Amino acid sequence: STPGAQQVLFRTGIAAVNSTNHLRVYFQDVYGSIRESLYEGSWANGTEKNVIGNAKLGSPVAATSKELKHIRVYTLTEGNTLQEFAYDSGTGWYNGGLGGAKFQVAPYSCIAAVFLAGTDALQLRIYAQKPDNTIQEYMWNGDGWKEGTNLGGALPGTGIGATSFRYTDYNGPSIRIWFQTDDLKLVQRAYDPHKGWYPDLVTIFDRAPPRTAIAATSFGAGNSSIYMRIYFVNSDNTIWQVCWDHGKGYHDKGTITPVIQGSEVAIISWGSFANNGPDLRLYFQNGTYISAVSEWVWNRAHGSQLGRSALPPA
């Protein structure tokens, strides 16, 4: 292993954001600090000098962005309230206002976050689990944090995946989120601006390990058309992928890569099938230098391939 790799928490929460091929990756160190690694032509950072804040040890770690102009990172405090670390170009890193709302969640809650797509306005939806085990939406629309739609019960400690896209024939954004129910199914819930939250859950996978990681992305939005990918850790200790592709629906599922038992997972994407893409990047732990974070790549050039073996600070 390496002294750097040893600083990375085993089964750390992982998140990532990007603007095309400009990448940032968030993780927790063994002391509970949240650090940023970065790719700008090459990999750097992830050191003690790249701490953005502190969270309870074992905290979920979620992140969302508008390119790399605005980045928001969500974790849990020792008190099990949602908090936010914020980057704005020209301002740098600071503590955003979510903390002030003191939103109290289950000790075992996960977190997902999205900027609403297709607008220059900064609008955010956060998902987490309340003590009664229901999934709660929290909203920022430029004038303070408020609760949004409660989306019903889930498995206590369920992973939460989430994405926002805007159809080019729609006048507003859509949201899709994914979690695990008590019966151990992985389900989709869905928001469109006409039907609101659709009443029904759609099953994406019959049986998954209890509290498995869940990470999602979407790309290539068109006229009432989208592409989506959802990832989880199956019982074979590999990440599995589920595809939505326009005109085919939920039509493909299969293993992608081996990981450590109980690895967390982050996904980013950019581009589209119509324009020589997409590009996908997955981050996870697979045992490289024991505790380092590893990368998986997909692009048109070469399809599925292992990427950076050990991320900084490894």
Ligand X SMILES: C[C@@H]1O[C@@H](O)[C@@H](O)[C@H](O)[C@@H]1O
Ligand Y SMILES: CC(=O)N[C@@H]1[C@@H](O)[C@H](O)[C@@H](CO[C@@H]2O[C@@H](C)[C@@H](O)[C@@H](O)[C@@H]2O)O[C@@H]1O
Ligand Z SMILES: CC(=O)N[C@@H]1[C@@H](O)[C@H](O)[C@@H](CO[C@@H]2O[C@@H](C)[C@@H](O)[C@@H](O)[C@@H]2O)O[C@H]1O
- Binding site: what residues are annotated? 24, 36, 43, 72, 84, 93, 97, 125, 137, 145, 149, 176, 188, 197, 229, 241, 243, 245, 251, 281, 295
Q: Is 313 in the site for ligand Z (CB under 6 A)?
A: no
> In whole angstroms, what is the distance from residue 135 CA to residue 89 CA?
32
Is 140 an interacting residue with respect to ligand Y (CB under 6 A)? Answer: yes
Token digits for 91? 């301002």
Give the integer Cα–Cα distance in Å for 2 and 314. 6
Q: How far is the CB of 25 from a second copy (least distance, A)?
A: 20
Per the structure block, which two tokens stand in for 31?
A: 């002391």
Among 57, 139, 190, 297, binds a second copy (CB under 8 A): 57
| Cα-to-chain-centroid distance, residue 150 | 20
Q: Is the dihedral of CA 105, 191, 214, 11 positive or negative?
A: negative
- Cα separation values, 166 from 15, 82, 144, 201, Å: 22, 27, 24, 21
Is 139 among the residues that bind ligand Y (CB under 6 A)?
A: no
Site for Na ion in 47-76 (CB under 5 A): 58
Within a 10 A sphere around the Cβ of 107, how many other Cβ atoms? 13
| Selected binder of a second copy within 63, 105, 106, 110 (CB under 8 A) | 106
Residue 115 bridge partners (DSSP):
124
Total residues interacting with ligand Z, rule: CB under 6 A: 6
Q: Which is nearer to ligand Y, 39 or 145 (CB)?
A: 145
Cβ closest to ligand X, residue 38 vs residue 184:
38
Instruction: Specify burial of residue 133 (Cβ count, 10 A radius: 0-12, 13-18, 19+).
Output: middle
Residue 98 engages ligand Y in binding (rule: CB under 6 A): yes
Which residues contact a second copy (rule: CB under 8 A)? 1, 6, 10-11, 30-31, 56-58, 106-108, 133, 155-157, 182, 209-211, 233, 235, 237, 260-262, 287, 290-291
Residues engaged in binding ligand Y (CB under 6 A): 72, 84, 86, 88, 91, 96-98, 122, 124, 140
